[PDB]
Amino acid sequence: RKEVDGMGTSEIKYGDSICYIQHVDTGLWLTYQA
Amino acid sequence: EIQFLRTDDEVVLQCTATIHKEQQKLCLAAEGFGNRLCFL
Amino acid sequence: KGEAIRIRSILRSLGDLVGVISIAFQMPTIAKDGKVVEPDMSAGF
Amino acid sequence: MKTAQGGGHRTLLYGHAILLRHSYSGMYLCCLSTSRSSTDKLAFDVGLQEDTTGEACWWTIHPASKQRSEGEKVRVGDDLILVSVSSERYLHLSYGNSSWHVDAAFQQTLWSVAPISSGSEAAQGYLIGGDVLRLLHGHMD
Amino acid sequence: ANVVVRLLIRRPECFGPALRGEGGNGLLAAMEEAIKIAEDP
Amino acid sequence: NYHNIWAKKKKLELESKGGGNHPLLVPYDTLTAKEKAKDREKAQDIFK
Amino acid sequence: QLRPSMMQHLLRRLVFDVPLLNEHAKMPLKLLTNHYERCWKYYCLPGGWGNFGAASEEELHLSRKLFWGIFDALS
């Protein structure tokens, strides 16, 4: 999936979804550390 | 497939011009809060 | 109005043409013949 | 005031007078009545302003290519020439000012168009490309 | 007149040295240079 | 009288030169502002 | 502003007999610019032109009387 010339997905909600953002090279990266 | 531009749309301005043996696609940019004249 | 003040402003833009007094009222008048001679028709304004 | 007499969503045809508005600055791209702008010619300068009255704030699209000519649905990826307001100027790329510089010159210049984001769908719980958003982790703090 | 002036300003013709940077119409110094070169080879 | 004397001297030196002309032979009412400034300066000097 | 030589320079250019039928652009200009100019600023009339016109009987300036009487009126 390289060509992006139109979208009708609406996959992620603005306040009804949870993101687990993953860096391309690391894998998790984002996590709290108290 | 037929696509065109109407009102309330997503227009943005682009142009390619090879200056000093370098082709680049410049975009029109402006901001009213800091200046008036535009800059590529 | 209508395509008149537009052309007038376009002609006026060529500032420089607003002040042409130094050319119109310029003084290379040259009496030419003057007293008796030198009636240069070919060269001169 | 305005009292517009148009339903909207009319497709822009070659030769129609158009109005541009900044999605961020809230103003309209126009041909300023001033001059100079680090240029030495009869050209004008481009800028933004708020009032839409007068013959300014309007631009007419003319087709650079003879394939489309006047009166056609302007598709994407085409080439357009903008000429309107008070000098029949064009969005010319003046490279003589040590770099690219847009001024209201009298020499036509190519100018393409692209669709940047969208014109159909609202938010509707759909993250769009380019927006200000939060990054809450614990859902409260 | 409209088409004549439009086609005149869409392609500058004269070589005005007073404007120098512009296409021409440098009447400030063009006639001075002409009247100087009149008494010259 | 001073202008007449100056014009006579100019005519005499032009006749001695054998050729030339000068457009300075102008009546006082026909004089331009450049020479009018000198005329006013001379008048002020005479008054003082 | 001041009092230029317009009262006498135009007449001096007019009395040149070398051009023929070229004066027709001179007397309407003179007649209108005499009426347009105020009588207060018009001070070089007698010695400038009227004495010469009086000394002339049937000279080329046949309309000298009319030119003098344009601004005379009756008050």
From Swiss-Prot, chain B:
Highly expressed in heart, lung, cerebellum and brain. Detected at lower levels in adrenal gland, stomach, thymus, esophagus and ovary. It is found in: Sarcoplasmic reticulum membrane. Channel activity is modulated by phosphorylation. Phosphorylation is increased in failing heart, leading to calcium leaks and increased cytoplasmic Ca(2+) levels. Disruption phenotype: Embryonically lethal. Embryos die at about 10 dpc, due to defects in heart tube development. Cardiac myotubes display enlarged rough endoplasmic reticulum and cytoplasmic vesicles that contain high levels of Ca(2+). Cytosolic calcium-activated calcium channel that mediates the release of Ca(2+) from the sarcoplasmic reticulum into the cytosol and thereby plays a key role in triggering cardiac muscle contraction. Aberrant channel activation can lead to cardiac arrhythmia. In cardiac myocytes, calcium release is triggered by increased Ca(2+) cytosolic levels due to activation of the L-type calcium channel CACNA1C. The calcium channel activity is modulated by formation of heterotetramers with RYR3. Required for cellular calcium ion homeostasis. Required for embryonic heart development. Belongs to the ryanodine receptor (TC 1.A.3.1) family. RYR2 subfamily. The calcium release channel activity resides in the C-terminal region while the remaining part of the protein resides in the cytoplasm. Homotetramer. Can also form heterotetramers with RYR1 and RYR3. Interacts with CALM and S100A1; these interactions regulate channel activity. Identified in a complex composed of RYR2, FKBP1B, PKA catalytic subunit, PRKAR2A, AKAP6, and the protein phosphatases PP2A and PP1. Interacts directly with FKBP1B, PKA, PP1 and PP2A. Interacts with FKBP1A and FKBP1B; these interactions may stabilize the channel in its closed state and prevent Ca(2+) leaks. Interacts with SELENON. Identified in a complex, composed of FSD2, CMYA5 and RYR2. This is Ryanodine receptor 2. The gene is Ryr2.
From Swiss-Prot, chain G:
It comes from the Eukaryota. Highly expressed in heart, lung, cerebellum and brain. Detected at lower levels in adrenal gland, stomach, thymus, esophagus and ovary. Disruption phenotype: Embryonically lethal. Embryos die at about 10 dpc, due to defects in heart tube development. Cardiac myotubes display enlarged rough endoplasmic reticulum and cytoplasmic vesicles that contain high levels of Ca(2+). Channel activity is modulated by phosphorylation. Phosphorylation is increased in failing heart, leading to calcium leaks and increased cytoplasmic Ca(2+) levels. Homotetramer. Can also form heterotetramers with RYR1 and RYR3. Interacts with CALM and S100A1; these interactions regulate channel activity. Identified in a complex composed of RYR2, FKBP1B, PKA catalytic subunit, PRKAR2A, AKAP6, and the protein phosphatases PP2A and PP1. Interacts directly with FKBP1B, PKA, PP1 and PP2A. Interacts with FKBP1A and FKBP1B; these interactions may stabilize the channel in its closed state and prevent Ca(2+) leaks. Interacts with SELENON. Identified in a complex, composed of FSD2, CMYA5 and RYR2. Cytosolic calcium-activated calcium channel that mediates the release of Ca(2+) from the sarcoplasmic reticulum into the cytosol and thereby plays a key role in triggering cardiac muscle contraction. Aberrant channel activation can lead to cardiac arrhythmia. In cardiac myocytes, calcium release is triggered by increased Ca(2+) cytosolic levels due to activation of the L-type calcium channel CACNA1C. The calcium channel activity is modulated by formation of heterotetramers with RYR3. Required for cellular calcium ion homeostasis. Required for embryonic heart development. The calcium release channel activity resides in the C-terminal region while the remaining part of the protein resides in the cytoplasm. This is Ryanodine receptor 2. It comes from Mus musculus. The gene is Ryr2. The chain holds residues 2578 to 2652 of 4966 of the full protein.
